[PDB]
Design a protein around this motif. Sequence first.
Motif, PDB file in Angstrom:
ATOM      1  N   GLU A  89      21.047  19.951  40.375  1.00  0.00           N
ATOM      2  CA  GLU A  89      19.775  20.588  40.074  1.00  0.00           C
ATOM      3  C   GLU A  89      18.890  19.545  39.372  1.00  0.00           C
ATOM      4  OE1 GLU A  89      19.601  23.335  36.635  1.00  0.00           O
ATOM      5  OE2 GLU A  89      18.066  24.521  37.671  1.00  0.00           O
ATOM      6  N   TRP A  90      17.650  19.346  39.850  1.00  0.00           N
ATOM      7  CA  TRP A  90      16.680  18.463  39.199  1.00  0.00           C
ATOM      8  C   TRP A  90      16.027  19.294  38.058  1.00  0.00           C
ATOM      9  CZ3 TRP A  90      11.461  19.737  38.992  1.00  0.00           C
ATOM     10  CH2 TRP A  90      10.602  18.779  38.436  1.00  0.00           C
ATOM     11  N   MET A  91      16.099  18.814  36.825  1.00  0.00           N
ATOM     12  CA  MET A  91      15.560  19.514  35.668  1.00  0.00           C
ATOM     13  C   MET A  91      14.065  19.220  35.380  1.00  0.00           C
ATOM     14  SD  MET A  91      18.831  19.006  33.247  1.00  0.00           S
ATOM     15  CE  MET A  91      18.385  20.216  31.953  1.00  0.00           C
ATOM     16  N   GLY A  92      13.696  17.957  35.469  1.00  0.00           N
ATOM     17  CA  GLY A  92      12.319  17.554  35.231  1.00  0.00           C
ATOM     18  C   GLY A  92      12.186  16.060  35.156  1.00  0.00           C
ATOM     19  N   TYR A  93      10.963  15.587  35.000  1.00  0.00           N
ATOM     20  CA  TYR A  93      10.676  14.170  34.818  1.00  0.00           C
ATOM     21  C   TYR A  93       9.463  13.916  33.923  1.00  0.00           C
ATOM     22  CZ  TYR A  93       7.058  13.997  38.602  1.00  0.00           C
ATOM     23  OH  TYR A  93       5.944  14.187  39.377  1.00  0.00           O
ATOM     24  N   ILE A  94       9.410  12.696  33.363  1.00  0.00           N
ATOM     25  CA  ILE A  94       8.284  12.163  32.601  1.00  0.00           C
ATOM     26  C   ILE A  94       7.795  10.977  33.445  1.00  0.00           C
ATOM     27  CG2 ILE A  94       9.622  10.653  30.954  1.00  0.00           C
ATOM     28  CD1 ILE A  94       7.504  11.873  28.713  1.00  0.00           C
ATOM     29  N   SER A  95       6.498  10.936  33.762  1.00  0.00           N
ATOM     30  CA  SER A  95       5.919   9.836  34.542  1.00  0.00           C
ATOM     31  C   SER A  95       5.798   8.534  33.694  1.00  0.00           C
ATOM     32  CB  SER A  95       4.535  10.221  35.049  1.00  0.00           C
ATOM     33  OG  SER A  95       3.630  10.342  33.961  1.00  0.00           O
ATOM     34  N   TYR A  96       5.461   7.418  34.361  1.00  0.00           N
ATOM     35  CA  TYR A  96       5.237   6.126  33.730  1.00  0.00           C
ATOM     36  C   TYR A  96       4.049   6.156  32.752  1.00  0.00           C
ATOM     37  CZ  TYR A  96       1.322   5.184  36.985  1.00  0.00           C
ATOM     38  OH  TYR A  96       0.126   5.228  37.654  1.00  0.00           O
ATOM     39  N   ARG A  97       3.247   7.249  32.785  1.00  0.00           N
ATOM     40  CA  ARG A  97       2.073   7.482  31.942  1.00  0.00           C
ATOM     41  C   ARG A  97       2.279   8.576  30.886  1.00  0.00           C
ATOM     42  NH1 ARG A  97      -2.410   8.072  36.601  1.00  0.00           N
ATOM     43  NH2 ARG A  97      -0.760   9.498  37.313  1.00  0.00           N
ATOM     44  N   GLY A  98       3.510   9.058  30.737  1.00  0.00           N
ATOM     45  CA  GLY A  98       3.849  10.043  29.718  1.00  0.00           C
ATOM     46  C   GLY A  98       3.631  11.509  30.043  1.00  0.00           C
ATOM     47  N   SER A  99       3.158  11.834  31.259  1.00  0.00           N
ATOM     48  CA  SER A  99       2.981  13.245  31.622  1.00  0.00           C
ATOM     49  C   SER A  99       4.261  13.828  32.269  1.00  0.00           C
ATOM     50  CB  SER A  99       1.719  13.482  32.462  1.00  0.00           C
ATOM     51  OG  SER A  99       1.512  12.541  33.506  1.00  0.00           O
ATOM     52  N   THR A 100       4.616  15.077  31.896  1.00  0.00           N
ATOM     53  CA  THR A 100       5.830  15.749  32.370  1.00  0.00           C
ATOM     54  C   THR A 100       5.638  16.794  33.481  1.00  0.00           C
ATOM     55  OG1 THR A 100       5.592  17.334  30.710  1.00  0.00           O
ATOM     56  CG2 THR A 100       6.890  15.413  30.121  1.00  0.00           C
ATOM     57  N   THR A 101       6.695  17.026  34.258  1.00  0.00           N
ATOM     58  CA  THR A 101       6.773  18.009  35.337  1.00  0.00           C
ATOM     59  C   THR A 101       8.167  18.611  35.208  1.00  0.00           C
ATOM     60  OG1 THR A 101       5.309  16.646  36.693  1.00  0.00           O
ATOM     61  CG2 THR A 101       6.570  18.298  37.846  1.00  0.00           C
ATOM     62  N   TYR A 102       8.282  19.960  35.145  1.00  0.00           N
ATOM     63  CA  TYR A 102       9.592  20.595  35.007  1.00  0.00           C
ATOM     64  C   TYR A 102       9.949  21.544  36.120  1.00  0.00           C
ATOM     65  CZ  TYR A 102       8.850  18.962  30.161  1.00  0.00           C
ATOM     66  OH  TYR A 102       8.570  18.224  29.040  1.00  0.00           O
ATOM     67  N   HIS A 103      11.223  21.937  36.159  1.00  0.00           N
ATOM     68  CA  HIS A 103      11.735  22.931  37.092  1.00  0.00           C
ATOM     69  C   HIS A 103      11.194  24.253  36.514  1.00  0.00           C
ATOM     70  CE1 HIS A 103      14.426  25.265  39.531  1.00  0.00           C
ATOM     71  NE2 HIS A 103      14.958  24.169  40.075  1.00  0.00           N
ATOM     72  N   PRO A 104      10.436  25.079  37.284  1.00  0.00           N
ATOM     73  CA  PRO A 104       9.854  26.299  36.684  1.00  0.00           C
ATOM     74  C   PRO A 104      10.852  27.219  35.963  1.00  0.00           C
ATOM     75  CG  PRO A 104       8.762  25.791  38.738  1.00  0.00           C
ATOM     76  CD  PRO A 104       9.986  24.925  38.683  1.00  0.00           C
ATOM     77  N   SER A 105      12.136  27.247  36.374  1.00  0.00           N
ATOM     78  CA  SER A 105      13.174  28.061  35.731  1.00  0.00           C
ATOM     79  C   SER A 105      13.543  27.548  34.334  1.00  0.00           C
ATOM     80  CB  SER A 105      14.433  28.085  36.590  1.00  0.00           C
ATOM     81  OG  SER A 105      14.125  28.475  37.918  1.00  0.00           O
ATOM     82  N   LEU A 106      13.489  26.212  34.147  1.00  0.00           N
ATOM     83  CA  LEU A 106      13.854  25.517  32.916  1.00  0.00           C
ATOM     84  C   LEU A 106      12.693  25.452  31.951  1.00  0.00           C
ATOM     85  CD1 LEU A 106      16.705  25.126  33.312  1.00  0.00           C
ATOM     86  CD2 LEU A 106      16.177  23.050  34.617  1.00  0.00           C
ATOM     87  N   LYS A 107      11.455  25.359  32.494  1.00  0.00           N
ATOM     88  CA  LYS A 107      10.202  25.325  31.719  1.00  0.00           C
ATOM     89  C   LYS A 107      10.246  26.542  30.801  1.00  0.00           C
ATOM     90  CE  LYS A 107       5.204  24.701  32.479  1.00  0.00           C
ATOM     91  NZ  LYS A 107       5.154  23.216  32.339  1.00  0.00           N
ATOM     92  N   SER A 108      10.201  26.303  29.466  1.00  0.00           N
ATOM     93  CA  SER A 108      10.280  27.267  28.333  1.00  0.00           C
ATOM     94  C   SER A 108      11.427  26.905  27.407  1.00  0.00           C
ATOM     95  CB  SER A 108      10.422  28.722  28.775  1.00  0.00           C
ATOM     96  OG  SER A 108      11.750  29.009  29.181  1.00  0.00           O
ATOM     97  N   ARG A 109      12.496  26.338  27.982  1.00  0.00           N
ATOM     98  CA  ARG A 109      13.673  25.877  27.259  1.00  0.00           C
ATOM     99  C   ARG A 109      13.729  24.341  27.242  1.00  0.00           C
ATOM    100  NH1 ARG A 109      19.377  26.655  28.742  1.00  0.00           N
ATOM    101  NH2 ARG A 109      18.776  26.982  30.924  1.00  0.00           N
ATOM    102  N   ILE A 110      12.977  23.681  28.149  1.00  0.00           N
ATOM    103  CA  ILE A 110      13.066  22.240  28.323  1.00  0.00           C
ATOM    104  C   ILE A 110      11.884  21.448  27.732  1.00  0.00           C
ATOM    105  CG2 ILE A 110      12.052  22.146  30.701  1.00  0.00           C
ATOM    106  CD1 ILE A 110      14.173  19.999  31.406  1.00  0.00           C
ATOM    107  N   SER A 111      12.213  20.244  27.224  1.00  0.00           N
ATOM    108  CA  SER A 111      11.275  19.265  26.700  1.00  0.00           C
ATOM    109  C   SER A 111      11.797  17.843  27.056  1.00  0.00           C
ATOM    110  CB  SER A 111      11.130  19.436  25.190  1.00  0.00           C
ATOM    111  OG  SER A 111      10.137  18.581  24.647  1.00  0.00           O
ATOM    112  N   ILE A 112      10.961  17.027  27.728  1.00  0.00           N
ATOM    113  CA  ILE A 112      11.274  15.625  28.063  1.00  0.00           C
ATOM    114  C   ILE A 112      10.202  14.752  27.378  1.00  0.00           C
ATOM    115  CG2 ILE A 112      11.713  13.823  29.840  1.00  0.00           C
ATOM    116  CD1 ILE A 112      12.448  16.308  31.719  1.00  0.00           C
TER     117      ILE A 112
END
Lengths: 210, 216
Positions: free
Chosen positions: A47-70
């Motif tokens: 399962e892919w959880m999320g990522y932080i781009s080379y510019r510091g912006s994040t994208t998360y798995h919608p199910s994990l978003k609320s519990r997750i921080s990168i």
Amino acid sequence: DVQLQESGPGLVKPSQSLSLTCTVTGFSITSPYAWNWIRQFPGNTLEWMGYISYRGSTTYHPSLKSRISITRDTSKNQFFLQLNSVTTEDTATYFCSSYGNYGAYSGQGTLVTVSAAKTTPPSVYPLAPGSMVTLGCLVKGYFPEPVTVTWNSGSLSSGVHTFPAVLQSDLYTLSSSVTVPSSTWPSETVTCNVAHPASSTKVDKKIVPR
Amino acid sequence: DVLLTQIPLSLPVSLGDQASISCRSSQSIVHSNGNTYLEWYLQKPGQSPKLLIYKVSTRFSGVPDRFSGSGSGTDFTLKISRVEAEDLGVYYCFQGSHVPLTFGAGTQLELKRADAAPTVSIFPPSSEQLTSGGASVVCFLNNFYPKDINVKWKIDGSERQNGVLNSWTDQDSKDSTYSMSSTLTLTKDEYERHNSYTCEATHKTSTSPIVKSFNR
């Protein structure tokens, strides 16, 4: 050359939060494109959880978003995973991964066990039978994973089968077998060596006829 | 969510043969920029998944030329022209085109071999365990092929399912076989109020099982 390495507590209590760190060497986390956290469930699916781009912006798995921080630390060349209201269901191997025009690099993975259980040493039982002879070893009720099972300190290996640990119930159990010629046992010594790092256990069990 | 469907899930091959794994997209995986972020990972046993192919057909650093990837729209294919022993493991397709980024179920690439019946071994509880009030009867169904086999336990002429825990090994690097262990966990009292303990290797029967037993 390029290497990603996960670190963090390998055991977390339910309701608590897991925190993992990825230390990058070889290139900057400031290089394109994505700096991902992935997980592999026990004997299972990725399962892919999320990522932080080379510019510091994040994208998360919608199910994990609320519990997750990168987050990241560009100075330390590290990026981080925080996963909040943990459940027994969050027990998985967590990998940190990078992606760009070169393709992708990954970490070796870190196993994170989510349990309320307390460090229990294993009970090691010698399994003797009631041309070739099969002997066994039962490594029952330990916590957490792993244990290391060998036969004759490593000098046997050939006809050895070590079985994955089954989880029941908050405790792990595994078995191992060795098949040697009948001329070899009980004439020669067959010993089961079990080590459990978490409880500083190191047991040697001789397989003796009944 | 984009669903990735892998065909087949088990691929038996002989060393040197061709192999093809298919990945079917439940919807288009063309990103807003025009690129298709379709990748193939290989996960060797004991290791982490490692990239083979990315952006549908671009091989990664150090990946042999026997591995190629193709596809368009919703159907993508991974081809291995000549299977080498280092190639065995689980192959995953992955899409990075639309959020959430998803993976297929994985395709176990396996080594084809002739059928082998298991070596069934039954072990009574160890006297060390009885000292604590437990009694585990252990059975091993070792070095068989293919995985089309099961365990059946019988205690004094009746099948028993409660207290049974099974464990399977991966395909053996020695002889391409499989093995499994079955454990029947009883209290010392349960064990001491029965006499006959049977372990059986069954196969869609029809067939006669391979039976191992002891009287207490």
